[PDB]
Write a protein that binds this ligand. Structure first.
Ligand SMILES: O=c1c(O)c(-c2cc(O)c(O)c(O)c2)oc2cc(O)cc(O)c12
Length: 844
């Protein structure tokens, strides 16, 4: 262990945000065991990735050009502007030419082929054997009807990515006692210990102890013998110890360790306090010992060795045809299991079929593995993310069952992996062991692609920072990725963390000045610009990669424009210059650092929104949403992308009117027209509004976050509406379709209109579009509530989304159901908003 070896670890831990070597909080060696087992897969991806292609991380898609983009193109032709210093030429190529057939054709028109096409002002290269039309930037430019400016520069040297040198007896447990240093005020409490043998979130068995008075020390020394036999215990089963006073304390212990051994010996586990969700499933113990409740137990080297009639048929398919949230009956399960090989021929049955398994029985499980052995039908089925996601949630704990889900994920191309990365990263919380297929799949895909890796870094880091329940597991996975991404990325991450940390302190040190009375003092803005000065001196990184948009390189601070927002939680409105000189503009980079809101929620919501945009893509729809970047940098803090030329709808009302609820109906249209002097840009901004508005209307409704204050919705000087603050979230409305909105669509009273009719038809089209992916949205929504909501979610919560999508209904009934929702908004006018103004603004 040279000084060099130690040094490396130190910085790694620094980047990680946690010390992955720490052992102060572990009752075994699973963590260390995983750090070692990931070394092979890590290296196995590193050496197998093309140095060049991994250096320029091309971003492409093998999906067909949507219909709304087909139009943007005229006769299989595209024009690209190539620049060389102040010399730039425009060329017209075929939408099927490769970036090489472009450079070659560029040397013809105007050592030798030692150059490459990069996007002006961005680290995004158009390279590889792929049609130019299959590059995201290209398709992005088309949609925005913008020009494609590329710069001819030198290809990065792959050397910069260099990687450093490398029993029939019934099971029984003994509860000795619980110890807690201090206790609650209401002190005439009573408590007992509930021991459960869980698996897949369902209890196979349960035992309890005699209730006793709640004291700083409670002994029992009672033997608890369950009914299930030691031989029946399935690998992945959990011994969930809980304390009731109402549940208050809980801790879990894997009965079968990572080595297939039966857990034994004396244990003193430090439990978690309850304030259902992902956290109640963790194997991790509470690190804080001096304050947490502790359970002392005892355990008894046993090793776990590695046709049908028409109405019956028609009743089987009826169950299989059921949605995800519909439970199963005793008969339901018995029917699914009896006909395993028949329910096996249909992939959409797997979830249902594998929950009908009696895992608490060695025999049944063994048969299951046999059943699974023959997976031709599955292996050859078409990838279905929604179906695959269902096998990765809290309902399954069998290593083999989950493994086949991951198996199908292997088919996803980088572009799609990017859409579901966040969700899949959260799914790790559902794994019973630190080392898993899903865990290795992510590690692998991160080392195989810089964009996937960049986000995998922050995604994991957000959880490492504010989740003591899973920071140990994630930290091991992050390290594994940091030990194989390269020295270049290892450097960017450093610059980014540095910039972040420094700005974090400031953001918080500024908020400390007035937290109950909005009033951005003149002196505060004076001190703010001062603290940044001290940093920009030479201590702050000259530049850094923007965490939510890695293709962008931020430079120096434009202290002049920086300020503290006139917001309650007083966030920071920072602006940077683009560190890239080849950029074709002078616009700054607006970044918002905020403390107070749980950005993990926004981050998750924003992601579903991106999932909905692509979903509409499959149907050739463009709702003009604006899922601005947002990354939870750490505990209660993170950044927010600033959308240029945009304001709050409320602000729009306040200017005309003021700090009153006497909302007008033309103010908005008067604000947009004023902004769009160029006529051709009004009707354009108007159609935009109709779509963006409709877009958010549909999406927001389905997610059950439509009733919202006028201050959390924004509009751009280009007519783009987009909801913002997704923080936590009598009269009520399905979504926001206020009079000022319907007005811009040329509709004063309850009278229809051309644009309003356009609006409606779009809403329906988008609404029906999502319904085709009901199952996908149902599972994502559920995982989100389980891993993204501080409180404990329930079935009721999940089922909402189901109703919103009107599952079971026909397209017609559906189409209508949404048109009625649109009506409520018309019959509610400014009612709701006025209430929000009265509630939020007045405190009533
Ligand atoms: O407090 C917030 C805020 O002010 C803005 C904002 C975004 C823009 O794009 C602007 O142009 C602007 O003026 C403000 O976004 C947010 C987005 C969130 O997810 C959460 C937030 O709390 C805010």
């Amino acid at each position: 262990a040279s000084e060099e070896t130690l040094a490396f670890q130190r910085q790694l831990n620094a980047l990680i945000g946690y010390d992955v070597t720490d052992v102060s909080n572990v009752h075994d060696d699973e963590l260390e065991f995983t750090r070692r087992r990931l070394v092979t897969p890590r290296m196995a991806e590193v050496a197998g990735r093309d140095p060049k292609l991994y250096a320029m991380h091309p971003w492409v898609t093998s999906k067909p050009l949507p219909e709304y983009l087909l139009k943007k193109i005229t006769n299989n032709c595209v024009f690209i502007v190539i620049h060389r210093s102040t010399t730039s030429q425009t060329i017209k190529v075929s939408a099927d030419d490769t970036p090489g057939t472009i450079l070659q054709s560029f040397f013809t028109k105007m050592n030798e082929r030692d150059f490459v096409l990069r996007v002006c002002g961005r680290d995004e290269y158009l390279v590889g054997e792929t049609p130019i039309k299959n590059f995201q930037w290209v398709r992005q430019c088309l949609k925005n009807g913008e020009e494609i400016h590329l710069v001819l520069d030198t290809p990065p040297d792959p050397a910069l990515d260099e990687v450093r040198k490398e029993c029939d007896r019934k099971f029984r447990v003994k509860i000795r006692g619980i110890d807690i240093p201090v206790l609650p005020r209401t002190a005439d409490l009573t408590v007992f210990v509930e021991a459960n043998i869980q698996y897949g979130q369902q209890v196979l068995c349960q035992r309890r102890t005699s209730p006793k008075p709640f004291t700083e020390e409670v002994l029992w020394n009672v033997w608890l013998e369950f009914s299930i036999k030691i031989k029946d215990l399935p690998k992945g089963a959990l011994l969930n110890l809980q304390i009731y006073c109402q549940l208050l304390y809980y801790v879990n212990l894997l009965l079968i360790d990572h080595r297939f051994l039966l857990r034994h010996g004396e244990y003193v586990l430090h439990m978690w306090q309850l304030s259902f969700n992902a956290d109640k499933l963790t194997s991790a113990t509470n690190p804080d010992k001096e304050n947490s409740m502790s359970i002392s137990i005892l355990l008894d080297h046993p090793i776990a060795l590695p046709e049908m009639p028409n109405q019956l048929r028609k009743q089987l398919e009826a169950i299989i045809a059921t949605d995800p949230l519909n439970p199963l009956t005793a008969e339901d399960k018995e029917l699914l299991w009896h006909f395993r090989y028949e329910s096996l021929k249909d992939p959409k049955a797997y979830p249902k079929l594998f929950s009908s398994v009696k895992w608490g029985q060695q025999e049944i499980v063994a048969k299951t593995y046999q059943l699974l052995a023959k997976r031709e039908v599955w292996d050859q089925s078409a990838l279905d993310v929604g179906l695959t996601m269902q096998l990765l949630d809290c309902n399954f704990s069998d290593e083999n069952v989950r493994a086949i889900a991951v198996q199908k994920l292997e088919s996803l191309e980088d572009d799609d992996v990017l859409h579901y990365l966040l969700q899949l990263v959260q799914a790790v919380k559902f794994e019973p062991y630190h080392d898993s297929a899903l865990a290795r799949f992510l590690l692998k895909r991160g080392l195989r692609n810089k964009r996937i890796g960049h986000f995998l870094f922050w995604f994991l880091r957000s959880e490492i920072a504010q989740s003591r329940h899973y920071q140990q597991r994630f930290a091991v996975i992050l390290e594994a990725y940091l030990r194989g991404c390269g020295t270049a990325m290892l450097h960017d991450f450093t610059q980014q963390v540095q910039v972040i940390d420094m700005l974090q302190k400031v953001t918080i040190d500024i908020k400390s000045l007035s937290a109950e009375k909005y009033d951005v003092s003149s002196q505060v803005i004076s001190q703010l610009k001062q603290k940044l000065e001290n940093l920009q001196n030479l201590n702050l990184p000259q530049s850094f990669r923007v965490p939510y948009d890695p293709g962008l390189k931020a430079g120096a601070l434009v202290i002049e424009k920086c300020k503290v927002m006139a917001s309650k939680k007083k966030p920071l409105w920072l602006e940077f210059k683009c560190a890239d000189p080849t950029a074709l503009s002078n616009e700054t980079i607006g970044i918002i650092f905020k403390h107070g809101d749980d950005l993990r929620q926004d981050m998750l919501i924003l992601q579903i929104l991106r999932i909905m945009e692509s979903i509409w893509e499959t149907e050739s729809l463009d709702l003009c949403l604006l899922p601005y970047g947002c990354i939870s940098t750490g505990d209660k803090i993170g950044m927010i992308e600033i959308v240029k030329d945009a304001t709050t709808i409320a602000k729009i009302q306040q200017s005309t009117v003021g700090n009153t609820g006497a909302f007008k109906d033309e103010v908005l249209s008067h604000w947009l027209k004023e902004k769009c002097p160029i006529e051709e840009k009004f009707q354009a901004a108007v159609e935009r509004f109709v779509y963006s508005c409709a877009g958010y209307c549909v999406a927001t409704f389905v997610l059950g976050i439509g009733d919202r204050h006028n201050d959390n919705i924004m509009i751009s000087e280009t007519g783009n509406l987009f909801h913002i603050d997704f923080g936590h979230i009598k009269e009520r409305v399905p979504f926001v379709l206020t009079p000022d909105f319907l007005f811009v669509m040329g509709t004063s009273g309850k009278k229809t209109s051309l644009h309003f009719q356009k609006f409606q038809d779009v809403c329906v089209k988008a609404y029906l579009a999502l319904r085709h992916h009901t199952n996908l949205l149902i599972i994502l929504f559920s995982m989100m509530l389980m891993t993204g909501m501080p409180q404990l979610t329930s079935k009721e919560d999940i089922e909402y989304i189901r109703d919103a999508l009107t599952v079971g209904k026909s397209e017609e009934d559906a189409k209508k159901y949404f048109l009625d929702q649109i009506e409520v908004c018309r019959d509610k006018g400014w009612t709701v908003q006025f209430n929000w103004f009265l509630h939020l603004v007045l405190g009533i």
